[PDB]
Ligand binder design. Structure first.
Ligand code: CDL
Ligand code: CDL
Ligand code: PLX
Ligand code: PLX
Lengths: 55, 273, 54, 54, 54, 55, 52, 54
């Protein structure tokens, strides 16, 4: 209940302030994608092991 | 006093002491997408009262105005402004991108990869044929034990069922007792204290259960705990080697997992794992 | 939780259209219906000389 | 949860055969047995006059 | 759950040695302590005429 | 195809890791200004839910 | 609640004894990483080592 | 749980500064406010000649 109320308060304060939440989410997901890619690239570049597949 | 360099959230920052404005000005700069030239330009634009600025190597040879900042933060250096020379020592940092000159070990691992690419097909092709044989071997070793385990877990289920229905019968007969007492023999003003202390005693027993068994009293969890206890205490009356059974089940699962992981690269021609 | 695996924010909680009105339009009429049921049953029981309080 | 992560629907929940009959067939007789041993215990206490409702 | 990802039986649950003894050796003494505490406190309030049971 | 992949995958993964670092350093720099607005919104969204709990 | 109290007690004892918990956590994670990619090298499917 | 997937230990749980004080500084004044509200409401109910206990 606390998390639901916090989310409703956030999604009202973000509409009042006209905050581009969509751009923020699509920008925070790309940093996550690029760091998961960097984490994957550790095997074939440091320990000379085969690369792990997606998932 | 002096100049310090710190990495915060993946970005380096450098705290410079400036002559014209005696205030510790901080510069947050990217190591890859910038050079020394742009850093000196930032310094000059910030102060606009510094005659010149230059960076030197720890020996004395001037470093070029085009080297990336990541190439610089490896080792120490000197930053000279028109009157002062600060020896800047960056934080200890080992590697940047694993991109450097070639090495004989790289050629050796390349030749190893070539040999692996040339022989892995014929390796996996008969490794699958050996795995499918080991799987049947393990599965035929398990057939005599599965029925014994079934006959043990049938008695375990029958006893857990008895326990559940007995709990229901108990909480029905308690209702019966209290309903007879409160309306036929005595009155409710006599049976209200008893029926509150029954509730409190039950609430205390549900906590002693947690104290004793290290887990909360929830129905499907206590049921599964009592089923496991009945099963493990029924395997003593049969001398059931549960270690062998667990080992066989784990080995069969691992063999099937290996087969599933290996056979897909043979169908769609993709990497292994 | 208020964030995803990354730093993104969860979508807005989907509220029900006129929820409080839709629940108080069900609670009250059935409350009165239960009141009527109780009154009629008590009257039927007392009329036939079955249970009389005093 | 309703669906699997891939999108398929979960299997049909298992249902105990004649559960609503078994439950009452266990509830009723033991409830009557409880009423019986309560009446008998109260009468046994009244015989010796250990506790009287006063 | 009673089985792992493979069809293997979970180990028997760890059982506290002498559970009912260690429970009823801490429930009864403190229940008697509470009884005597209430008795003494009520006699103390009765001697000073602060609250009298009528 | 497998042989050609084996011969030319270390240099390609090195270029890929360099591009990924150059892209992450730009994504984080672009995200830097939105974090301030996000925090200024989340403080107002958390104050009112602490008010709700205490109420 | 029991787990929360246990963690509080453990971390108060660790502060009272100066246990240097960070190095222990780092070493645990490094052992968890060093034996993962070691059993990944002795893979019975990929021919990475002789004596097959 | 007390440990991660490896043997590492979870961080110390966050503890609110001055917890009991911030709780009992908002429980007691509102008990007093509730007492006042109930007293005034009973007085007003007795004033309008509505509910007089006897
Ligand atoms: C009106 C008067 C009285 C009314 C009462 C009426 C009673 C009716 C109901 C009877 C209840 C019986 C108990 C059953 C409970 C569950 C049973 C169970 O688990 O199984 C036990 C048992 C085995 O299961 P298990 O896994 O082995 O148990 C082992 C563990 O310890 C595993 O332990 P665990 O860690 O997994 O957790 C279990 C643990 C969980 O912990 C607890 O249960 C917590 C209990 C703590 C209580 C806390 C205190 C409460 C506060 C109240 C204070 C009262 C004060 C009053 C005075 C003050 C003034 C008012 O409990 C126990 O194991 C202890 C036993 C359960 C007792 C139930 C406790 C309920 C609370 C009642 C106590 C209060 C009494 C006070 C009243 C006094 C009034 C003055 O069942 C069997 O298997 C029996 C086998 C028989 C032996 C031989 C084998 C074969 C026999 C078959 C023969 C037929 C076949 C023919 C042959 C055919 C082949 C050829
Ligand atoms: C019997 C044969 C079964 C064999 C196999 C089954 C056959 C398969 C058939 C295949 C499919 C058939 C297709 C159906 C065709 C049509 C489908 C459709 O559209 O709807 C079907 C559709 C679903 O059918 P389904 O596919 O078979 O699945 C449902 C299964 O029932 C769900 O079962 P489950 O396993 O998932 O688990 C459910 C289980 C869950 O277990 C229980 O619910 C517990 C069972 C009984 C209680 C046990 C002990 C209780 C303790 C009592 C104390 C002892 C006595 C005390 C005396 C003291 C005196 C000293 O049982 C129930 O829920 C049974 C219904 C009981 C709920 C009603 C509760 C309301 C209480 C109202 C009484 C208030 C009185 C107190 C106030 C007094 C003073 C003011 O029907 C439903 O609406 C089901 C949802 C629940 C509705 C409950 C109430 C609805 C009204 C039904 C009764 C009608 C007469 C009552 C009139 C009263 C008005 C005033
Ligand atoms: C076929 C009939 C023959 C009968 C003879 C068979 C003999 C079997 C022995 C009888 C065993 C008695 C088992 C009693 C357990 C059932 C009682 C319990 O379920 O009722 C509770 C009231 O009883 C009290 O809780 C006492 C509980 C005693 C604490 C555990 C003692 C026994 C546990 C040992 C293993 C039992 C496993 C059974 C799991 C169902 C409900 O109170 P409630 O407020 O609504 O629940 C709160 C919500 N919860 C459940 C989620 C927490
Ligand atoms: C899950 C567990 C739930 C437990 C529920 C407990 C509820 C049981 C409540 C029973 C209460 C009955 C006791 C009431 C006695 C009060 C009578 C009062 O006058 O005390 C007298 C004073 C008797 O004192 P006593 O000590 O009882 O003497 C015993 C007489 N003997 C020895 C002949 C038996």
């Amino acid at each position: 209940a606390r998390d639901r109320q916090y989310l409703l308060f956030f999604h009202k304060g973000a509409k009042k302030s006209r905050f581009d939440l969509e751009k923020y989410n699509q920008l925070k997901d790309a940093i996550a994608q690029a760091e998961m890619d960097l984490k994957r690239l550790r095997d074939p570049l440091q320990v000379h092991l085969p690369l792990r597949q997606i998932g | 006093d002096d100049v310090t360099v710190v990495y915060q959230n993946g970005l380096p920052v450098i705290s410079v002491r400036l002559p014209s404005r005696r205030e510790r000005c901080q510069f947050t700069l990217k190591p890859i997408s910038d050079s020394v030239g742009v850093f000196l330009r930032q310094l000059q634009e910030e102060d606009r009262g510094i005659d010149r600025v230059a960076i030197y190597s720890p020996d004395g040879v001037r470093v070029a105005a085009s080297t990336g900042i990541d190439l610089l933060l490896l080792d120490d250096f000197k930053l000279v402004i028109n009157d002062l020379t600060y020896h800047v020592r960056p934080p200890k940092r080992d590697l940047l991108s694993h991109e450097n000159a070639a090495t004989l070990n790289d050629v050796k691992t390349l030749v190893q990869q070539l040999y692996t690419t040339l022989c892995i097909e014929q390796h996996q092709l008969n490794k699958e044929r050996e795995l499918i044989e080991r799987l049947e071997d393990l599965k035929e070793q398990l057939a005599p034990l599965e029925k014994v385990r079934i006959e043990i877990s049938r008695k375990a289920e029958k006893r857990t069922t008895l326990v559940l229905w007995g709990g229901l019968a108990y909480m029905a007969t308690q209702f019966g007792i209290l309903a007879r007492l409160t309306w036929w023999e005595y009155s409710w003003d006599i049976m209200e204290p008893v029926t509150y202390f029954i509730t409190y005693g039950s609430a205390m027993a549900m906590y002693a259960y947690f104290v004793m068994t290290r887990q909360e009293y929830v129905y499907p969890e206590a049921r599964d705990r009592q089923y496991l206890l009945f099963f493990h205490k029924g395997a003593k009356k049969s001398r059931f080697d549960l270690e062998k059974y667990n080992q066989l089940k784990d080995a069969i699962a691992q063999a099937e997992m290996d087969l599933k992981r290996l056979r897909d690269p043979l169908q769609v021609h993709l990497p292994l794992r | 939780v208020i964030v995803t695996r990354s730093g993104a924010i969860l979508p807005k909680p989907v509220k029900m259209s006129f929820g409080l009105l839709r629940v108080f339009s069900i609670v009250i009429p059935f409350l009165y219906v239960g009141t009527l049921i109780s009154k009629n049953f008590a009257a039927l029981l007392e009329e036939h000389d079955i249970f009389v309080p005093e």
